[PDB]
Enzyme design. Structure first.
Site, PDB file in Angstrom:
ATOM      1  N   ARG A   1       0.781  -1.317  -0.020  1.00  0.00           N
ATOM      2  CA  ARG A   1       0.013  -0.224  -0.101  1.00  0.00           C
ATOM      3  C   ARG A   1       0.794   1.411  -0.225  1.00  0.00           C
ATOM      4  O   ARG A   1       0.780   1.957   0.817  1.00  0.00           O
ATOM      5  CB  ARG A   1      -0.957  -0.004   1.055  1.00  0.00           C
ATOM      6  CG  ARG A   1      -1.877  -1.207   1.198  1.00  0.00           C
ATOM      7  CD  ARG A   1      -1.249  -2.232   2.169  1.00  0.00           C
ATOM      8  NE  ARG A   1      -2.203  -3.341   2.641  1.00  0.00           N
ATOM      9  CZ  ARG A   1      -3.170  -3.028   3.606  1.00  0.00           C
ATOM     10  NH1 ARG A   1      -3.196  -2.309   4.534  1.00  0.00           N
ATOM     11  NH2 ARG A   1      -3.932  -4.336   3.815  1.00  0.00           N
TER      12      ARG A   1
ATOM     13  N   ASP B   1      -3.032  -8.871   1.041  1.00  0.00           N
ATOM     14  CA  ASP B   1      -4.064  -8.086   0.486  1.00  0.00           C
ATOM     15  C   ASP B   1      -4.934  -8.896  -0.680  1.00  0.00           C
ATOM     16  O   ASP B   1      -6.041  -8.467  -0.356  1.00  0.00           O
ATOM     17  CB  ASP B   1      -3.129  -7.000  -0.278  1.00  0.00           C
ATOM     18  CG  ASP B   1      -2.304  -6.006   0.519  1.00  0.00           C
ATOM     19  OD1 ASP B   1      -1.859  -5.023  -0.092  1.00  0.00           O
ATOM     20  OD2 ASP B   1      -2.762  -5.901   1.585  1.00  0.00           O
ATOM     21  N   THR B   2      -4.611  -9.878  -0.981  1.00  0.00           N
ATOM     22  CA  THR B   2      -5.700 -10.491  -1.842  1.00  0.00           C
ATOM     23  C   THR B   2      -6.764 -10.965  -1.100  1.00  0.00           C
ATOM     24  O   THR B   2      -7.900 -10.743  -1.471  1.00  0.00           O
ATOM     25  CB  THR B   2      -4.932 -11.841  -2.608  1.00  0.00           C
ATOM     26  OG1 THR B   2      -4.172 -12.287  -1.643  1.00  0.00           O
ATOM     27  CG2 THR B   2      -4.104 -11.306  -3.822  1.00  0.00           C
TER      28      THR B   2
ATOM     29  N   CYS C   1      -1.999 -19.653  -8.899  1.00  0.00           N
ATOM     30  CA  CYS C   1      -2.062 -19.636  -7.518  1.00  0.00           C
ATOM     31  C   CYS C   1      -1.756 -20.685  -6.825  1.00  0.00           C
ATOM     32  O   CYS C   1      -2.756 -21.667  -6.716  1.00  0.00           O
ATOM     33  CB  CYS C   1      -3.116 -18.781  -6.875  1.00  0.00           C
ATOM     34  SG  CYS C   1      -3.086 -18.614  -5.123  1.00  0.00           S
ATOM     35  N   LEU C   2      -0.747 -20.984  -5.908  1.00  0.00           N
ATOM     36  CA  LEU C   2      -0.518 -22.224  -5.195  1.00  0.00           C
ATOM     37  C   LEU C   2      -1.209 -22.028  -3.982  1.00  0.00           C
ATOM     38  O   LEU C   2      -1.763 -23.015  -3.265  1.00  0.00           O
ATOM     39  CB  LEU C   2       0.915 -21.946  -4.846  1.00  0.00           C
ATOM     40  CG  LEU C   2       1.973 -22.812  -5.799  1.00  0.00           C
ATOM     41  CD1 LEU C   2       3.503 -22.776  -5.333  1.00  0.00           C
ATOM     42  CD2 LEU C   2       1.607 -23.959  -6.421  1.00  0.00           C
ATOM     43  N   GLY C   3      -1.741 -20.719  -3.357  1.00  0.00           N
ATOM     44  CA  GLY C   3      -2.527 -20.441  -2.329  1.00  0.00           C
ATOM     45  C   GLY C   3      -3.944 -20.722  -2.434  1.00  0.00           C
ATOM     46  O   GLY C   3      -4.682 -20.479  -1.505  1.00  0.00           O
TER      47      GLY C   3
HETATM   48  C1  HEM Z   1      -8.234 -14.331  -2.922  1.00  0.00           C
HETATM   49  C2  HEM Z   1      -7.105 -14.851  -2.803  1.00  0.00           C
HETATM   50  C3  HEM Z   1      -6.008 -14.977  -3.731  1.00  0.00           C
HETATM   51  C4  HEM Z   1      -5.957 -14.570  -5.127  1.00  0.00           C
HETATM   52  C5  HEM Z   1      -7.191 -13.867  -5.933  1.00  0.00           C
HETATM   53  C6  HEM Z   1      -4.638 -14.814  -5.532  1.00  0.00           C
HETATM   54  C7  HEM Z   1      -4.167 -14.606  -6.976  1.00  0.00           C
HETATM   55  C8  HEM Z   1      -3.137 -15.047  -7.476  1.00  0.00           C
HETATM   56  C9  HEM Z   1      -2.630 -15.063  -8.934  1.00  0.00           C
HETATM   57  C10 HEM Z   1      -3.507 -14.179  -9.852  1.00  0.00           C
HETATM   58  C11 HEM Z   1      -1.507 -15.321  -8.965  1.00  0.00           C
HETATM   59  C12 HEM Z   1      -0.652 -15.350 -10.331  1.00  0.00           C
HETATM   60  C13 HEM Z   1       0.263 -14.095 -10.578  1.00  0.00           C
HETATM   61  C14 HEM Z   1       0.917 -14.279 -11.762  1.00  0.00           C
HETATM   62  O1  HEM Z   1       0.814 -15.307 -12.518  1.00  0.00           O
HETATM   63  O2  HEM Z   1       2.126 -13.403 -11.809  1.00  0.00           O
HETATM   64  C15 HEM Z   1      -0.962 -15.885  -7.960  1.00  0.00           C
HETATM   65  C16 HEM Z   1       0.375 -16.639  -7.525  1.00  0.00           C
HETATM   66  C17 HEM Z   1       0.480 -17.171  -6.438  1.00  0.00           C
HETATM   67  N1  HEM Z   1      -0.151 -17.083  -5.190  1.00  0.00           N
HETATM   68 FE1  HEM Z   1      -2.010 -16.394  -4.901  1.00  0.00          FE
HETATM   69  N2  HEM Z   1      -3.934 -15.529  -4.701  1.00  0.00           N
HETATM   70  C18 HEM Z   1      -4.735 -15.601  -3.433  1.00  0.00           C
HETATM   71  C19 HEM Z   1      -4.179 -16.101  -2.298  1.00  0.00           C
HETATM   72  C20 HEM Z   1      -2.997 -16.756  -2.084  1.00  0.00           C
HETATM   73  C21 HEM Z   1      -2.849 -17.264  -0.827  1.00  0.00           C
HETATM   74  C22 HEM Z   1      -3.509 -17.224   0.838  1.00  0.00           C
HETATM   75  C23 HEM Z   1      -1.245 -17.645  -0.983  1.00  0.00           C
HETATM   76  C24 HEM Z   1      -0.489 -18.364   0.470  1.00  0.00           C
HETATM   77  C25 HEM Z   1       0.766 -17.986   0.721  1.00  0.00           C
HETATM   78  C26 HEM Z   1      -0.825 -17.513  -2.376  1.00  0.00           C
HETATM   79  C27 HEM Z   1       0.319 -17.780  -2.676  1.00  0.00           C
HETATM   80  C28 HEM Z   1       0.879 -17.639  -4.142  1.00  0.00           C
HETATM   81  C29 HEM Z   1       1.949 -18.058  -4.553  1.00  0.00           C
HETATM   82  C30 HEM Z   1       3.104 -18.713  -3.872  1.00  0.00           C
HETATM   83  C31 HEM Z   1       1.888 -17.887  -5.927  1.00  0.00           C
HETATM   84  C32 HEM Z   1       3.005 -18.052  -6.858  1.00  0.00           C
HETATM   85  C33 HEM Z   1       2.869 -19.203  -7.924  1.00  0.00           C
HETATM   86  C34 HEM Z   1       3.836 -18.987  -8.833  1.00  0.00           C
HETATM   87  O3  HEM Z   1       4.698 -18.283  -9.264  1.00  0.00           O
HETATM   88  O4  HEM Z   1       4.412 -20.320  -9.409  1.00  0.00           O
HETATM   89  N3  HEM Z   1      -1.856 -16.780  -2.879  1.00  0.00           N
HETATM   90  N4  HEM Z   1      -2.070 -15.712  -6.763  1.00  0.00           N
HETATM   91  C1  LIG Z   2       4.846   7.296 -11.841  1.00  0.00           C
HETATM   92  N1  LIG Z   2       5.585   5.891 -11.690  1.00  0.00           N
HETATM   93  C2  LIG Z   2       6.163   5.346 -12.722  1.00  0.00           C
HETATM   94  C3  LIG Z   2       5.411   5.387 -10.597  1.00  0.00           C
HETATM   95  C4  LIG Z   2       6.431   5.107  -9.724  1.00  0.00           C
HETATM   96  C5  LIG Z   2       6.185   4.486  -8.364  1.00  0.00           C
HETATM   97  C6  LIG Z   2       4.970   3.809  -8.077  1.00  0.00           C
HETATM   98  C7  LIG Z   2       3.967   3.987  -8.797  1.00  0.00           C
HETATM   99  C8  LIG Z   2       2.840   3.390  -8.414  1.00  0.00           C
HETATM  100  S1  LIG Z   2       2.606   2.683  -7.050  1.00  0.00           S
HETATM  101  O1  LIG Z   2       3.072   3.574  -5.993  1.00  0.00           O
HETATM  102  O2  LIG Z   2       1.154   2.193  -6.839  1.00  0.00           O
HETATM  103  N2  LIG Z   2       3.536   1.362  -7.218  1.00  0.00           N
HETATM  104  C9  LIG Z   2       3.094  -0.082  -7.648  1.00  0.00           C
HETATM  105  C10 LIG Z   2       3.763  -1.177  -7.228  1.00  0.00           C
HETATM  106  C11 LIG Z   2       3.229  -1.871  -6.362  1.00  0.00           C
HETATM  107  C12 LIG Z   2       3.660  -3.403  -6.188  1.00  0.00           C
HETATM  108  C13 LIG Z   2       3.552  -4.002  -4.886  1.00  0.00           C
HETATM  109  C14 LIG Z   2       2.949  -5.310  -4.801  1.00  0.00           C
HETATM  110  C15 LIG Z   2       3.960  -6.544  -4.630  1.00  0.00           C
HETATM  111  C16 LIG Z   2       3.445  -7.473  -3.409  1.00  0.00           C
HETATM  112  N3  LIG Z   2       2.580  -8.599  -4.411  1.00  0.00           N
HETATM  113  C17 LIG Z   2       2.776  -9.737  -4.953  1.00  0.00           C
HETATM  114  O3  LIG Z   2       4.171 -10.101  -5.206  1.00  0.00           O
HETATM  115  C18 LIG Z   2       1.659 -10.366  -5.739  1.00  0.00           C
HETATM  116  C19 LIG Z   2       2.260 -11.318  -6.653  1.00  0.00           C
HETATM  117  C20 LIG Z   2       1.186 -12.140  -7.292  1.00  0.00           C
HETATM  118  C21 LIG Z   2       0.361 -11.311  -7.989  1.00  0.00           C
HETATM  119  C22 LIG Z   2      -0.279 -10.291  -7.135  1.00  0.00           C
HETATM  120  C23 LIG Z   2      -1.031 -11.116  -5.953  1.00  0.00           C
HETATM  121  C24 LIG Z   2      -0.039 -11.869  -5.027  1.00  0.00           C
HETATM  122  C25 LIG Z   2       0.500 -12.946  -6.195  1.00  0.00           C
HETATM  123  C26 LIG Z   2       1.111 -11.030  -4.524  1.00  0.00           C
HETATM  124  C27 LIG Z   2       0.851  -9.311  -6.477  1.00  0.00           C
HETATM  125  C28 LIG Z   2       1.698   3.531  -9.271  1.00  0.00           C
HETATM  126  C29 LIG Z   2       1.742   4.289 -10.450  1.00  0.00           C
HETATM  127  C30 LIG Z   2       2.909   4.817 -10.722  1.00  0.00           C
HETATM  128  C31 LIG Z   2       4.041   4.779 -10.050  1.00  0.00           C
END
Ligand code: HEM
Ligand SMILES: CN(C)c1cccc2c(S(=O)(=O)NCCCCCCCCNC(=O)[C@]34C[C@H]5C[C@H](C[C@H](C5)C3)C4)cccc12
Ligand SMILES: [K+]
Length: 404
Positions: A176, A241-242, A347-349
């Protein structure tokens, strides 16, 4: 608005801002769904946020997620600077290297671990709900949703309960952002917490997720301390956050829809089906990929290094995937979505997440069946890589509740 690259044709330009879509006030899913109006091509270029492609339809979103050879996870976030700094495992990795890291992560969050945690998730949901129940009000997002998944992670990872506020602080700092620190800076502050714990558990491992990960084997050899750190960072953040934001969308909808609440009250066996339909309607993630080479994709010339946003949120909202997509129906026959992603990074979670959602709904509806949005409150949404709810003030008459 970033200068239009020469290779992008004019007729494909739609300046969608994923961090501040117009008409956000009307609901975030609705704001994104403008990309699916009939005059919008399947693949568009926005000049916002540095300039990037957006695939607007489930068919293209799915296809791109399948095609890791062209659409790489090396830079998965917009803006580019965040995508570049991001090094979490396995989310910043492509197959084939990703496969075995994914397998190791699956050991700590997969289905057998979930079946085991079932009752422990329930006890946590109950204690939170009972604490709120006689008050007749809460901010759901702050009072239930935010404390819930971090507590589940602590249990998984064998981290002490007293660490929760600090870890919440570090993760909030990253996901955030208020603009006071770069993603890179936030990531390092998070890594500074994880580094000693990994070191401790490689010397003296237990049976917690961190010990299992930090002492795992990958692609022939032992995992490095660096790789373990990068995986733990994701295992922590991925479920926060998800889950918080998704539970908030769901509870907002149920507070606003007495008829859907009553359906689940009268028919609790429909809650698992209801969970799936809410996952479709209130889908909330949007990350993407970077082009590994020049590539023509559905008649559009993409250039090596272009970023493409592939919003997981949009597939299930696509009228080509689900008829009357903004309508919630818990009896939907074929609920299609990519809420948990698609392809090699699915998603693994997802199993853990579904139990969290289903347990929450079951336990809430049993104890506090009748609740509403606080009158005069207008719920504010936020948009980004994980879209969400700013706050969710709920009210109820405690006389309609039961300590269970
Ligand atoms: C409503 C809840 C959730 C949503 C909508 C969600 C969504 C996603 C999505 C869209 C991705 C794929 C991102 C990509 O392809 O770049 C992802 C990956 C992943 N999520 Fe979730 N997630 C949720 C909950 C969780 C939870 C509870 C965990 C547990 C720690 C988790 C762990 C992971 C991991 C480890 C991956 C990576 C899989 C990989 O890269 O092989 N997620 N998730
Ligand atoms: C002006 N310019 C260039 C800017 C500069 C700086 C900031 C800017 C922002 S900004 O301030 O909003 N920054 C955006 C970056 C936020 C990413 C953080 C998420 C990482 C954790 N989550 C995951 O890994 C996951 C990975 C995976 C997908 C998803 C859910 C799970 C699983 C967790 C995310 C907005 C717009 C512009 C900006
Ligand atoms: K990167």
């Amino acid at each position: 608005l970033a200068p239009l690259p020469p290779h992008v044709p004019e007729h494909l330009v739609f300046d969608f801002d994923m961090y501040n879509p117009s008409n956000l006030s009307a609901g975030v899913q609705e704001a994104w769904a403008v990309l699916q109006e009939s005059n919008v091509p399947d693949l568009v270029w926005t000049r916002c946020n540095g300039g990037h492609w957006i695939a607007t339809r489930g068919q293209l979103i799915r296809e791109a997620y399948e095609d890791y050879r062209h659409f790489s996870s090396e830079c998965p976030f917009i803006p580019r600077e965040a995508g570049e700094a991001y090094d979490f495992i396995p989310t910043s990795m492509d197959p084939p290297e990703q496969r075995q890291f994914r397998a190791l992560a699956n050991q700590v969050v997969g289905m057998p671990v979930v079946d085991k945690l079932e009752n422990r998730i329930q006890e946590l949901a109950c204690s939170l709900i009972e604490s709120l129940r006689p008050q007749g009000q809460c901010n759901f997002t702050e009072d239930y949703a935010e404390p819930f998944p971090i507590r589940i992670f602590m249990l998984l990872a064998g981290l002490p309960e007293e660490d929760i506020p600090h870890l919440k602080y570090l993760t909030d700092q990253m996901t955030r952002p208020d603009g006071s620190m770069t993603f890179a800076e936030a990531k390092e502050a998070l890594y500074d917490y994880l580094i000693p714990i990994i070191e401790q558990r490689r010397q003296k491992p237990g049976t917690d997720a961190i010990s299992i990960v930090a002492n795992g084997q990958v692609n022939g050899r032992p995992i490095t301390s660096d790789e373990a750190k990068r995986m733990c960072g994701l295992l922590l953040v991925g479920g926060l956050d998800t889950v918080v934001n998704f539970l908030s969308f769901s509870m907002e909808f149920l507070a606003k829809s007495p008829e859907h609440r009553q359906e689940l009250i009268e028919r609790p066996e429909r809650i698992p089906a209801a969970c799936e339909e809410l996952l479709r309607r209130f889908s909330l993630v949007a990350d993407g990929r970077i082009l590994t080479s020049d590539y023509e994709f559905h008649g559009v010339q993409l250039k090596k290094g272009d970023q493409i946003l592939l919003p997981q949120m949009l597939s299930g909202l696509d009228e080509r995937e689900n008829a009357a997509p903004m309508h919630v129906d818990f009896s939907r026959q074929k609920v299609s979505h990519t809420t948990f992603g698609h392809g090699s990074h699915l998603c693994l979670g997802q199993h853990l997440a579904r139990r969290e959602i289903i347990v929450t709904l079951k336990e809430w509806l049993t104890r506090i069946p009748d609740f509403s949005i606080a009158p005069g409150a207008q719920i504010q949404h936020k948009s980004g890589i994980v879209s969400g709810v700013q706050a969710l003030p709920l009210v109820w008459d405690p006389a309609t509740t039961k300590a269970v």
